[PDB]
Every structure is written in structure tokens, then in C-alpha cells.
Design a protein around this ligand. Structure first.
Ligand SMILES: Nc1ncnc2c1ncn2[C@H]1CC[C@@H](COP(=O)(O)OP(=O)(O)OP(=O)(O)O)O1
Ligand SMILES: [Mg+2]
Lengths: 105, 658
DNA sequence: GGCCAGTGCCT
DNA sequence: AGGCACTGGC
């Protein structure tokens, strides 16, 4: 269902996805990150075809994140071809997210 | 006798204006105040006691009021003023030989909020007493619009100052008495506030003399300085700052950065419940559109680069490598000293390789800090005259040992230590070009041979009747030890003894260690004899919570098990204190003048050794020999049962003289 | 800054 | 054992 990126996988997986990938930097120690967790999971199914959801832990992949000035988590980026389309840090509701997305998707 | 004190415009090293001087002559019972104009008179007054062959009492005057007057005398009046040691008393010196067990703030150069134990009465009442004058002045002017300036409370003389002056002396005379009152160091039958210097000195416990002469000499050494090679060290600082820069890079590569939670205010609360789960990293719930957040918690984190200096990072990264921390600290953390680091064994090859680079990176730092970047770094402490005047406390130990500081020149890495060849080479006579001839001086390093093992010999002769004494000299000592304790190698015995972690030192870790002490303190009943005789004179649950030192002084003792070392460290301590005193003295009773402008100069004294500076190789060799007699003297003088000795060495710097 | 913790340098 | 003091972390 949901994509599980890696430092080495990130490029050819999100960057050249051509489609829209909402990358989610996270860590098993952040409460909020564990919160938005299931949200994004269902977001993935209720958006199959139009949106691709890819999670990337920053404890396991410390190289990637430090490039988007990540200063918080779950920092969310909606990738739309090479560059960041939109950024949002926090646990947006199962409805708040569907609003932050659509208004961009 | 008289009890004076003076207020100048600055510390010795920068003082240039006498502000006032109070005095309380004991034969008059008066307090004659001298003002800035009276300076010359002040000098006359003191110079008067010396004529009577009287005694002048100062509080820390040995290291200041006294040499600061010699300075100011030439300066302000083009006068040659020189109070002779013999007529000077120093309540600080004394208060350090009587209150040996407490602790001082060093006259207000350290915060007592971090200093343990109990603070004295006048001590805290003469040291902090300086700040009482600051605020008293600051206030009286911090209200009159005039903004307090850095330290303008001392730029110019005034009445407030003239007052705090006069009070200084009273507290001083007050102290002076509470000290002379001590029947252990001063016999009640005499009243020293009424004797001449020659009577004060002889008619009192020997420590009082040995301490003052020392306090006076080392104060001379301090003022001398230690020619320090700024260049050679600035040179090293670049070589290290560099080797650092690499090891860092080479590492930061092997150990990437990472994120850590930092900055969360509130506490993550269960989605349903609402419990303030602590274990979980604090978050920040704020607002919310190019909005950054929503009202939707989030843990604020920081990006942190591996830091070889951080013993934490070293534990982190190395643990994720598969290291299983054995030794931890009574604070819930793993011991990461070089010891364990040496032992750590992970699987990733590149990584275990980097353990040896941290070990070295940590050390490179112990050097860059001690020499260049630290607060008491050499490079920060070098004087304009190209010498480092580290301070020396001729006591402050408890056994008699001095304490060095600012910077501490008794912890320069030795030559048997990474870069301990370049550091030592930067402290040397050879770095001082003569005043006239303009030619480099020569250094003379003299040190006491086996002073330790010997203090034991002597003390355990009242049992061995010359055994170890003779062994240590007319034969061999260590093999007897090596045989004493059932041990394998001699060098092992050299450690076993000079260190009494024992069992370990031989192989095992407990039983064999706590078995050797048995066979050793069994085939050598003399050390066993000593040990017993002491417990007998202290234990009964105390009788005398102290011990008597070679000169007479009381030498407090922390614990029954420390009893013997105490007794031993002290003996060798005083032995040297007295030694460097005689040495210089003798060098004078021969014809040489102490000082840079003279023939020789004391540069350093690290327990059982001294680094004298000589103007000519000739003089240099005499000192080396003068140092000999002196020691031998100290021997007969204290009826030592084991001939003591010294070994000389001549050279350009501390590095080649050891 | 002021302050402990964990360490390492000398004899 | 007796001291001083550097760096990291709060
Ligand atoms: N662990 C130690 N702690 C303190 N001082 C020590 C320690 N080990 C040795 N020493 C002292 C003893 C005298 C000094 C130099 O030792 P060194 O081994 O050169 O002389 P030594 O008298 O033991 O033997 P020798 O002169 O025959 O070689 O260092
Ligand atoms: Mg004073």
C-alpha cells in the first residue's frame, strides 16, 4: 500500500516519480509522527491513482532529510516533480489532511 | 611588632599607585593612617621596625603588600625599599599552617558556592571583604547618575577606601592573635606580639619558620617566571588544530549526523486518554494557507553532527555498532574512558578503526586545551616579558605539598606522552636571553631520588634497624620487594610498591591482589610494624585525628587506611620544601644572586624536583652540586635514618632536563 | 555565566 | 594517593 523509501531509494522513487508523492519524514520516537501515521495510511488508499504516499524514517535514513531544512516532525512535503510543492509540519486530521492535499491535489 | 596593610591601584602584576597604608604598632596601641602623600612616611614607619629588629605582620603580604611596595617604592619615589624576610610575618601563610583542614577562596579568586566543607571566619571575612568595598562604592555612585565603570573602585584613593583599609588591619591583628594563641605552634610562656624577629622565629615551632621562608621563596619564583616559547607552542597549536580538523572530517564521515528531540514544551497526551506520557519526547501544540502548522502536535527536533569530544555521541554511535557496555556509572551511564575504548570491539571494520581515531581525537583535545584554547591555557597566560608566572600555593595540600595553578605548571604532559616532548621543550632557561650579554641562559633540573621509598625506609627503621634503609642504598631494593611479595617480574614489583587495582596489575583482579599484600606484608614485617604502630597512635573512635610532621606541624589525617601514605607523603613533602629553601640559601651564602639580573633564578618546583635557571653553565653546575649538599643537610637536620640524595642534569629546557 | 559529570595530566 | 582543569550538557 504505502511506500517505504530509503536514503538510496529516495531519488529515483520520489524525485522522478513524475506523479505526486507526499513524503513523510518521521521517527518511532515522535508521538505526533505516530499519530499522523494511520491517517496517511488511509490517505494512501482513499487516494490511490491520483496520489502516492511514501514514508521515510529519518533515524534509519539520516542523509535525506537534512536538505529540506527539516526542523520538525512529522514534516510533510507534497512532491510534485523534482521540487517541493508544499510543506506542513504536524498531525493534520484525517480530514485536515484531505483538505491540505486536495487544495494542492 | 606591627600589623600593616596597603591599598594599591591594581594587582601586583600591574600596580603603579600606592593609595594608603594603615598600621597598628603593638608598642603604641595606635592606628596611624598614612595617605597617598604619606606613602614615603609609611615606608619610613616600616623601615623603622626593621631598625628595631622588630616584626612586620601582613595578610598575604609575602606575595603582595611586600613585593608591591618594593615595586611602588622605586616607581613613585625612585626609592630602594626592601623589607628582609626575617622581619616579616604573613597571617595567610600562618592561617594555612593552622587551618590545614578547612578551605579558602584564595582571597576572592574563586566562588565558595562550589567549594566543599566549612569556610573560616576572618577568611571569608577578609577575602569577600573586598567586594564589600565594591558595592559600598558602586552604590554610593550607582545612584548619582555615574554609571559604574568596569572596576573604577580602585582607580583613585578616597576615604571609603581609607576606611576599609583601617578595618583590614584590625581583622588582621584579630587573626594574627587567634593564630599565635595556638599552643601547638606557639608556646604560651612567650608573647610573640612582644618579641623580636630572632625570638619569634627560634622560640616557635619549626613549621612557622620553614613555611614563611618557603612562602617567601616561591613568591620569588612566581615573580621570576618560566621562560616560555610562545612561538614553539603557537607552532604546535597549528599542528594540532590541523590534525584535529582531519580526524574530525575523517570521522564525521564514518559517523553521520542524526536527529534528536529538542524544544518541546507540552507533553504528548494520549489520543484518547490524555495522560502526560513523559518517556515520549516533548512536543509543541500551537494557528492553522501556506501555514506551517495546524490546531496538531509535533516534536521539534535538532540536527546534530557527531562530535568526537562528546562522550555521549561516542557511546551512542559505538553502541549501535553492537558494543555491549560493561562498566557503567552510578548515574546510569557507560564509562567511556580510553580504557574501555581500547577494549571496545564492534564488527564493522571501518568503525572499529574509528575508535582508535577518537581515542587520538580526544587526546589531541587534551593538548589543544591545555596549551591554546583552554581558560588557563599557556598561550593566554604568557606575560609581556615572555614568561609564564603560574601561581604556587606553598601549602593548600594538607600534607605539605604545594598546589600549582593559573596555569597549573605541575601537570605539563611529560616527555613520555604524545606531544609531551614539544610542551616540555617550550619551558626552559634557553628561552630567556640574558639582560646584558643577550645570550641564552642554561637550565638546571635537580630532583630527589626515591624520596618516596626512602621516607618509608627511615620510618620503618625503628623496626628494620637499617634493613630497607641499607637495601635501598648499598645494594638493591626492588628485587627484595619482588621477592617480598610472591611476584614474577621486577618491573611488576616497581609498580606494586610505588602504588600502595593490585590484582589486576599482576593479572587477576581480586584474590591474587588481596593475597599479595599478604605475602608482601608478611615477608616484610617492618612495613607491617609501621602500619600497626600508627593505628596504635590514632585509633582507640579517635584519639589524635592527626599526625606530627618532620618539622613539628600537625598533619591531619582523613582515614585510618590513609594513615601511612599521609605520614609518608608529608615526610617527603617537607623534606623538599626544606630542601629548596636550604639550596637557594646556600647558593647565596656562596656568592650568587637570585633573580634574572643575577646569576640564577628559580623557575619551577614540582614536588620532588626543581628547575633552576642559571646564567652560565658554570653556575649551573654549582647549583646542581649545591642542591646536593642542601639535601644531605636536610638529612642530618632531621636525623633521617636513610641517606637522601638528588640527581642533577643540565640543559636548555624542561624537556632535556628530565 | 554558574554548575555537576566524567576524565586525564602531573608528581 | 594529592592536586588542577578541559569539554559537554543542562
Ligand atoms: N606508580 C608510581 N607512582 C609514583 N611514582 C612512581 C611510580 N612508579 C615509579 N615511581 C617513581 C620511583 C622513582 C621514579 C623513577 O622511577 P625509576 O624506575 O626510574 O627508578 P627506580 O628507583 O624504580 O629504579 P632504577 O633507578 O634502578 O631504574 O618514579
Ligand atoms: Mg591585603
Amino acid at each position: 500500500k504505502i511506500i517505504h523509501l530509503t536514503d538510496d531509494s529516495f531519488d529515483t522513487d520520489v524525485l522522478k516519480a513524475d506523479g505526486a508523492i507526499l513524503v513523510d519524514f518521521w521517527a518511532e520516537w515522535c508521538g505526533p509522527c505516530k499519530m499522523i501515521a494511520p491517517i496517511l495510511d488511509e490517505i494512501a488508499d482513499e487516494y490511490q491513482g491520483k496520489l502516492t504516499v511514501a514514508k521515510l524514517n529519518i533515524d534509519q535514513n539520516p542523509g535525506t532529510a537534512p536538505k529540506y531544512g527539516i526542523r520538525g516532525i512529522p514534516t510533510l512535503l507534497l512532491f510534485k516533480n523534482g521540487e517541493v510543492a508544499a510543506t506542513k509540519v504536524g498531525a493534520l486530521s484525517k480530514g485536515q489532511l484531505k483538505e491540505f492535499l486536495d487544495a494542492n491535489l | 611588632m606591627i600589623v600593616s596593610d596597603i591599598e594599591a591601584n591594581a594587582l601586583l602584576e600591574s600596580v603603579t599607585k600606592f593609595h594608603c597604608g594603615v598600621i597598628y604598632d603593638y608598642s603604641t596601641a595606635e592606628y596611624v593612617s598614612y595617605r597617598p602623600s604619606d606613602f614615603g612616611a609609611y615606608l619610613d614607619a616600616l623601615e623603622a621596625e626593621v631598625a628595631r629588629g622588630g616584626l612586620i605582620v601582613f595578610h598575604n603580604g609575602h606575595k603582595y603588600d611586600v613585593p608591591a611596595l618594593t615595586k611602588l617604592a622605586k616607581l613613585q619615589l625612585n626609592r630602594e625599599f626592601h623589607l628582609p624576610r626575617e622581619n616579616c610575618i604573613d597571617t595567610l601563610v600562618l592561617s594555612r599552617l593552622i587551618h590545614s583542614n578547612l578551605k579558602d577562596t584564595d582571597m576572592g579568586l574563586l566562588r565558595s558556592g562550589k567549594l566543599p566543607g566549612a569556610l573560616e571566619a576572618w577568611g571569608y571575612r577578609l577575602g569577600e571583604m573586598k567586594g564589600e568595598y565594591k558595592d559600598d562604592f558602586k552604590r554610593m555612585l550607582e545612584e548619582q547618575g555615574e554609571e559604574y565603570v568596569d572596576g573604577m573602585e580602585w582607580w583613585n584613593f578616597n576615604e571609603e577606601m581609607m576606611d576599609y583599609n583601617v578595618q583590614d588591619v584590625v581583622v588582621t591583628k584579630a587573626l594574627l592573635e587567634k593564630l599565635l594563641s595556638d599552643k601547638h605552634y606557639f608556646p604560651p610562656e612567650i608573647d610573640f606580639t612582644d618579641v623580636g624577629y630572632t625570638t619569634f622565629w627560634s622560640e616557635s615551632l619549626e613549621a612557622v619558620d620553614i613555611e614563611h621562608r618557603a612562602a617567601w621563596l616561591l613568591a620569588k619564583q612566581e615573580r621570576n617566571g618560566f621562560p616560555f616559547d610562545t612561538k614553539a607552542i603557537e607552532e604546535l597549536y597549528v599542528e594540532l588544530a590541523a590534525r584535529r580538523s582531519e580526524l574530525l572530517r575523517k570521522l564525521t564521515e564514518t559517523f553521520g549526523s542524526w536527529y534528536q528531540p529538542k524544544g518541546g514544551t507540552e507533553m504528548f497526551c494520549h489520543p484518547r486518554t490524555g495522560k502526560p506520557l513523559p518517556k515520549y519526547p516533548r512536543i509543541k501544540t500551537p494557528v492553522g494557507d501556506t501555514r506551517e502548522y495546524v490546531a496538531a502536535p509535533y516534536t521539534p527536533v535538532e540536527h546534530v553532527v557527531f562530535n568526537p569530544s562528546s562522550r555521549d555521541h561516542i557511546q551512542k554511535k559505538l553502541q549501535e555498532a553492537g558494543w555491549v557496555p560493561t562498566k557503567y556509572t552510578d548515574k546510569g551511564a557507560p564509562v567511556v574512558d580510553d580504557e574501555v575504548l581500547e577494549g571496545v570491539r564492534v564488527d564493522d571494520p571501518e568503525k572499529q578503526a574509528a575508535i582508535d581515531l577518537i581515542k587520538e581525537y580526544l587526546m589531541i583535545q587534551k593538548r589543544i586545551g591545555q596549551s591554546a584554547e583552554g581558560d588557563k591555557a599557556w598561550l593566554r597566560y604568557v606575560a609581556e616579558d615572555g614568561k609564564i608566572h603560574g601561581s604556587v600555593n606553598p601549602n593548600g595540600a594538607v600534607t605539605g605539598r604545594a598546589t600549582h595553578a593559573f596555569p597549573n605548571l605541575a601537570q605539563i604532559p611529560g616527555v613520555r606522552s604524545p606531544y609531551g616532548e614539544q610542551c616540555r621543550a617550550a619551558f626552559g632557561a634557553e628561552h630567556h636571553l640574558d639582560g646584558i650579554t643577550g645570550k641564552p641562559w642554561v637550565q638546571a633540573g635537580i630532583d630527589a631520588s626515591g624520596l618516596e621509598l626512602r621516607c618509608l625506609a627511615h620510618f620503618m627503621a625503628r623496626f628494620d634497624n637499617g634493613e630497607y634503609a641499607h637495601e635501598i642504598l648499598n645494594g638493591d631494593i626492588h628485587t627484595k620487594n619482588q621477592i617480598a611479595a610472591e611476584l614474577p617480574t621486577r618491573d611488576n614489583a616497581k609498580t606494586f610498591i610505588y602504588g600502595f587495582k593490585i590484582g589486576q596489575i599482576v593479572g587477576a583482579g581480586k584474590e591474587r591482589g588481596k593475597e599479595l599484600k599478604k605475602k608482601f606484608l608478611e615477608n616484610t614485617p617492618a612495613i607491617a610494624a609501621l602500619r600497626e604502630s600508627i593505628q596504635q597512635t590514632l585509633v582507640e573512635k579517635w584519639k589524635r585525628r592527626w599526625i606530627k610532621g618532620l618539622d613539628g606541624r600537625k598533619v591531619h589525617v582523613r582515614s585510618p587506611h590513609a594513615a601511612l601514605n599521609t605520614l609518608l607523603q608529608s615526610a617527603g613533602a617537607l623534606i623538599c620544601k626544606l630542601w629548596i629553601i636550604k639550596t637557594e640559601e646556600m647558593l647565596v651564602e656562596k656568592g650568587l644572586k637570585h633573580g634574572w639580573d643575577g646569576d640564577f633564578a628559580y623557575m619551577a618546583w614540582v614536588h620532588d624536583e626543581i628547575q633552576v635557571g642559571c646564567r652560565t653553565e658554570e653556575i649551573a653546575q654549582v647549583v646542581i652540586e649545591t642542591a646536593q649538599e642542601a639535601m644531605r643537610w636536610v638529612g642530618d637536620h632531621w636525623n633521617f635514618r636513610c641517606l637522601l640524595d638528588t640527581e642533577g642534569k643540565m640543559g636548555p629546557n624542561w624537556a632535556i632536563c628530565h
